[PDB]
Structure formats: structure tokens, C-alpha cells
Structure 1
Amino acid sequence: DRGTETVPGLGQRKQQILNSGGGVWDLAIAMLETKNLGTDYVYGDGKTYDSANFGIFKQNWFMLRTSTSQFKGQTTNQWNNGAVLNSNLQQDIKARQESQNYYGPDKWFAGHRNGESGLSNPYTQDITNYKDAVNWIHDQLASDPKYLSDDTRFWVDV
């Protein structure tokens, strides 16, 4: 299942993300993680330690602490450090980009979804379904420049 919906104010947030170092690809990922391109879901998305999620992409702390310049070398026990990404969009965006440039896109998808255990085999069907959804959303945003500044959300039910 997939479709469109109108979210008042989403256009301004899209532009803020592109103005903060995000690309269209980052927008597609974020668009699929929350409806408001926000960080105001429950803290850690209700998870802790290596599983905790932070920022507009819901990056997990395992990924943050292994593949970003901002968190490289920090421990599982230090997972609460990731919460600064809930209020620094520029750092949030730069972290995800560095994480993806460290692992490459295929492994990034796998670690983003399944953590440490996903890095073993990036190509299971579960990871593929997520990858496919992000790609469908990117294709829609890239089909008309007005989707980069209007209130249209493209959603996929993964």
C-alpha cells in the first residue's frame, strides 16, 4: 500500500532540510520515517541502547556509534548522546550521510533496519522491502520540482 496525503507546513520543513545539507534522497528517507519530517516521536522511538532511534531518519545508536564522525567510538552505554540529533538538524543530516558513505548504500540500509545483525547479509527480503519503498518515494519527489516545496507527503506501508 502506498499513496499521497497533504500535511500542512510540510513544504517549509522540506525546504529547511534541503537548506541544511539534505538532498532529495535524504528527504525520501525522512519522508518514510515520519509524517511531519520531525523528531518529536517518543524518545528513542521507545528503544534503548544500541536499538535507540534518533533524529528525522530514526537512525539507531549502533549505526551512529560505528560510522559517524560525531559519535564514532562511543559505547552502547552512551546511547543517550544520540539525542542531540533530535534538535540539531544539520548534525542529524550529516550523520546519516557519513553513515551511508561509510557502509555504502546497501549495507547502510541493512544496518539502519536490522542493526548489527543486518550488516551480515544486506540482501534479505525484509531489508529489500524497505529499500524499495524509499526508492519509490524518491522517484515521486524527483518527478516534479513542486514536491520539494509543497505539502505533499508520499507514504508507503512497509
Structure 2
Amino acid sequence: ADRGTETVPGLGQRKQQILNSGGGVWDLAIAMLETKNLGTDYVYGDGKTYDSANFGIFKQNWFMLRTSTSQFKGQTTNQWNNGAVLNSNLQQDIKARQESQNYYGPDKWFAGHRNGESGLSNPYTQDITNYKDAVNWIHDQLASDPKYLSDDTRFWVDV
């Protein structure tokens, strides 16, 4: 198969932190696919620079953060290192992402999250649609039983 489960020790305490710091099950599912341990200790920017750089547990790219969040509204591609603050502020991480989705709408947020500025022109490419449904599958799992909100079960889908 191309999706399943895996045990990650401590994951349950990270899930509760996200749900107690302004997150909902929807944010948990997005963050669950981005990283294995719901954290921010991947390589800085996820290896990318300028508008492509990724920050926070959801790996929001800088283009999205500076066009659609109040924390970064109006900043330029050159200030892209400023997004790094989300790596250590979970509440702002979660809040930036919720604000971003509500500025663009769920489907264009998806397109922007996955492809950056160039996705905004067609939110329904197969690539972006494969991101949506994966996240939607994971949400269904976490919402099928509340034990999954505090155990170490990671529901994963292959990209």
C-alpha cells in the first residue's frame, strides 16, 4: 500500500500540545504528513531559500507566509529568514497557517502550500489534488477514534 500507521514515541504528547495551543484535528493531519514527529528539526528551510523556504510544523513556504499572514504581511522575499521564528513558537505556527488558509480559501491555500505562487493559477492539478486527499485520508483516521489524538499512532501517506 501507499499509506499506513507507525508508532512514534512521544507523538501523543505533541498531538495534545497542538490541540491545546490553538490547533484542530485538521491542523494535526496536515502536520502529521509534513514530518514524522510533529516537530521542526528538519533541515533549516527544508533546504530551500527565498519564497520556497519552509518553516514550522506544517512547512509553510515563505511566499505564503508573507502574502497571507499578519505576522509577516508585506515582507519581501529577501526577509525570508524571518519565518524561522515559527520553528520555536508553536502558537504562531498554528495561527499563521489558519490565517493563511482563511485568506486564500482551502483550495487555493492547498495550491499555494504545495506549489507556491505558481499553484495559485490552477488549484486542481493532480499533484495538488493528491496532497488534499492524503491529508483528508489522515484526518479521517484521527477522527475515527479519539484515542488517536493522544497515542503515538502516526497515520502516513506516501507524499
Give yes or no for TM over 0.5: yes
What displacement does 1:99 show?
Answer: 0.1
What displacement does 1:65 show?
Answer: 0.2
Deviations 1:93-150 (A, max 9, x none): 0000000000000000000000000000000100000001000000000000000000
**In 1: Cα distance, 2:140 partner to 2:73 partner:** 32
What displacement does 1:26 show?
Answer: 0.1
Is 2:135 the partner of 1:134? yes
**In 1: Cα distance, 2:88 partner to 2:120 partner:** 28
Q: Which residue of 2 is the match for residue 23 of structure 1?
A: 24
How many pairs are equivalent?
158
Uncovered stretches (5+) of structure 2, i.e. residues with no partner: none
Uncovered stretches (5+) of structure 1, i.e. residues with no partner: none
* CA RMSD between the two structures: 0.3
**In 2: Cα distance, 1:20 partner to 1:133 partner:** 24
For residue 9 of structure 2, give the secondary structure of its aligned residue in structure 1.
Answer: coil
**In 1: Cα distance, 2:9 partner to 2:40 partner:** 17
Structure 2 length normalisation: TM-score? 0.99
**In 1: Cα distance, 2:88 partner to 2:12 partner:** 19
Structure 1 length normalisation: TM-score? 1.00
What displacement does 1:76 show?
Answer: 0.2
What displacement does 1:49 show?
Answer: 0.3
